Amino acid sequence: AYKLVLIRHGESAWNLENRFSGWYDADLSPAGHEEAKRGGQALRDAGYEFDICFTSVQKRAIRTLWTVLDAIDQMWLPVVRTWRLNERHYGGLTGLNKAETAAKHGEAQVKIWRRSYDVPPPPMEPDHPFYSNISKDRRYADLTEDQLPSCESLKDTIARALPFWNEEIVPQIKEGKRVLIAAHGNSLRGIVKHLEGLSEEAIMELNLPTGIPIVYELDKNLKPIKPMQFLGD
Amino acid sequence: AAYKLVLIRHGESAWNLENRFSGWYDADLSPAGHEEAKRGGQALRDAGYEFDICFTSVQKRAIRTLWTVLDAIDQMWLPVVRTWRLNERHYGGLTGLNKAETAAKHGEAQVKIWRRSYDVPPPPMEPDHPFYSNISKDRRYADLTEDQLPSCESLKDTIARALPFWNEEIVPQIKEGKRVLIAAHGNSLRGIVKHLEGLSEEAIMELNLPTGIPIVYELDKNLKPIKPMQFLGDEET
Numbered sequence: 414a415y416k417l418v419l420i421r422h423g424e425s426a427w428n429l430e431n432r433f434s435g436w437y438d439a440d441l442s443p444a445g446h447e448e449a450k451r452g453g454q455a456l457r458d459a460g461y462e463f464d465i466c467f468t469s470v471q472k473r474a475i476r477t478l479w480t481v482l483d484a485i486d487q488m489w490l491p492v493v494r495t496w497r498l499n500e501r502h503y504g505g506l507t508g509l510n511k512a513e514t515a516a517k518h519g520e521a522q523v524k525i526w527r528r529s530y531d532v533p534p535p536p537m538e539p540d541h542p543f544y545s546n547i548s549k550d551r552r553y554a555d556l557t558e559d560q561l562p563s564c565e566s567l568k569d570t571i572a573r574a575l576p577f578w579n580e581e582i583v584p585q586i587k588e589g590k591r592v593l594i595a596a597h598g599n600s601l602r603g604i605v606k607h608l609e610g611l612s613e614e615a616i617m618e619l620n621l622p623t624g625i626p627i628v629y630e631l632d633k634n635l636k637p638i639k640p641m642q643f644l645g646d
Numbered sequence: 647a648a649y650k651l652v653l654i655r656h657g658e659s660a661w662n663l664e665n666r667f668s669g670w671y672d673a674d675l676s677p678a679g680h681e682e683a684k685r686g687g688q689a690l691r692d693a694g695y696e697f698d699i700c701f702t703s704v705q706k707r708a709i710r711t712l713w714t715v716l717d718a719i720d721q722m723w724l725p726v727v728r729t730w731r732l733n734e735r736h737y738g739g740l741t742g743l744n745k746a747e748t749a750a751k752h753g754e755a756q757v758k759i760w761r762r763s764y765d766v767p768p769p770p771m772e773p774d775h776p777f778y779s780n781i782s783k784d785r786r787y788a789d790l791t792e793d794q795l796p797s798c799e800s801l802k803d804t805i806a807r808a809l810p811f812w813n814e815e816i817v818p819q820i821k822e823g824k825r826v827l828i829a830a831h832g833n834s835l836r837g838i839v840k841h842l843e844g845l846s847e848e849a850i851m852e853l854n855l856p857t858g859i860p861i862v863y864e865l866d867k868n869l870k871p872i873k874p875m876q877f878l879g880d881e882e883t
């Protein structure tokens with residue numbers, strides 16, 4: 414029975430997890446850092462051991478992983494970072510709070526976006542205050558023109574995450590390597606969807622909690638042999 | 647020049663404060679060591695340095711130094727490669743002894759021999775050593791052949807197992823134009839400086855690298871330094 418563990422980072426600075434932070438590289442808030450500590454301590458009290466870690470290229474996920482690896486005295490582990498595990502790209506909405514989103518686009522369009530699986534929000538355009546900050550970030554310079562999103566539907570997000578799971582993470586798990594994934598709600602969502610074979614309506618309802626380890630036990634075909642478990646209280 | 651390389655040696659560890667031999671023991675930075683790294687990182691930030699790949703040991707006092715630097719220069723997203731081959735020199739049986747216990751037990755003449763020689767290792771870490779299993783049975787070394795896992799190391803041993811990693815895994819990255827950062831330890835960095843500068847044994851044994859301070863090499867396309875190593879920081883530092 415393979416053992417797999419996911420963790421989702423906690424709160425970021427300037428309330429950005431409630432402002433469609435997306436591909437903006439918001440750091441963790443102090444509270445989010447503390448959550449990561451607690452998730453780490455939990456993994457330590459339970460004596461978990463990993464052999465390799467996967468994360469995104471966004472600092473709030475990376476710091477969550479650093480914090481965890483610190484807590485469990487495993488900062489020596491190999492770490493692979495990939496843009497394919499980034500949070501969903503929210504296009505023009507990146508940085509808007511809920512009221513500003515409604516004011517600028519109207520309630521009807523917002524609802525359709527909230528509930529649609531393959532309707533992207535509007536793309537982030539060059540006068541967006543995050544446009545060059547994200548799309549001209551060195552860390553994406555190896556991405557083809559069609560790989561760099563200006564916006565993403567949830568389906569887009571999953572479609573770009575799944576290839577990295579297939580080609581990079583599955584082979585590690587199959588070799589018996591205990592894997593830890595520190596990433597974001599919507600990239601984790603694609604992994605949980607493909608694991609449990611969930612529906613679009615189902616994955617759009619799943620609300621993964623932040624800062625607590627998410628344990629999977631999988632059979633020899635990478636299928637869950639029970640539901641997901643949490644670690645802590 | 648064609649290429650630029652940055653090295654950094656970690657600062658003070660918890661066992662430095664106890665003046666104990668660490669070697670492969672995985673001692674964490676002291677708070678002052680952590681601040682050293684923050685200043686080093688800040689010096690890299692103020693000079694606008696950019697990297698593409700990082701290499702480090704599997705010892706937390708180097709890894710945390712690298713973490714602290716990547717944080718300071720806002721490049722936490724960079725790929726990072728960890729390897730035992732960049733570990734501090736293994737001090738064998740002296741591991742965990744402090745200065746007084748070492749002097750008391752072995753005397754000045756024998757210690758002076760050890761300090762001044764290049765290919766004379768200290769006594770091996772025997773299985774009844776108090777840190778034998780904490781180090782030699784630590785699972786981070788499970789992939790090592792019985793020949794690779796040292797019981798003790800001369801400086802020549804440490805450089806001999808460091809240089810293969812620099813030839814096989816760092817040189818290709820450099821010749822590929824990747825801007826490299828190595829965060830490691832005094833004696834593994836000694837291997838690299840010895841190789842880059844063609845220094846003699848006598849010279850390398852006399853070389854003490856500053857800690858928590860960015861060490862900058864300007865290399866030509868053959869990886870030959872074109873000037874002496876430079877340091878980044880304020881006038882005093």
Ligand SMILES: O=C(O)c1cc(-c2ccc(F)c(Cl)c2)cc(NS(=O)(=O)c2ccc(-c3ccccc3)cc2)c1O
Pocket residue numbers: 744745746748749750753754755757
């Ligand atoms: O003034 C003196 O009489 C004098 C005496 C000694 C001395 C005395 C008793 C001993 F048992 C030994 Cl081993 C050395 C040392 C120095 N200074 S030193 O040569 O630079 C020197 C510093 C430190 C270490 C050391 C470090 C770590 C572990 C073990 C030894 C060895 C040498 C003296 O000026």
Ligand SMILES: O=C(O)c1cc(-c2ccc(F)c(Cl)c2)cc(NS(=O)(=O)c2ccc(-c3ccccc3)cc2)c1O
Pocket residue numbers: 661662665666667668740744745748757760761767768851854
């Ligand atoms: O850098 C070098 O190449 C170097 C290497 C050695 C050395 C090497 C192998 C050995 F087996 C022994 Cl026993 C010593 C010694 C000195 N000089 S020293 O004065 O003797 C000296 C020794 C040890 C400490 C120390 C001990 C514990 C914690 C923190 C510091 C300080 C000072 C060197 O400059």
Ligand SMILES: [Cl-]
Pocket residue numbers: 492726
């Ligand atoms: Cl890392």
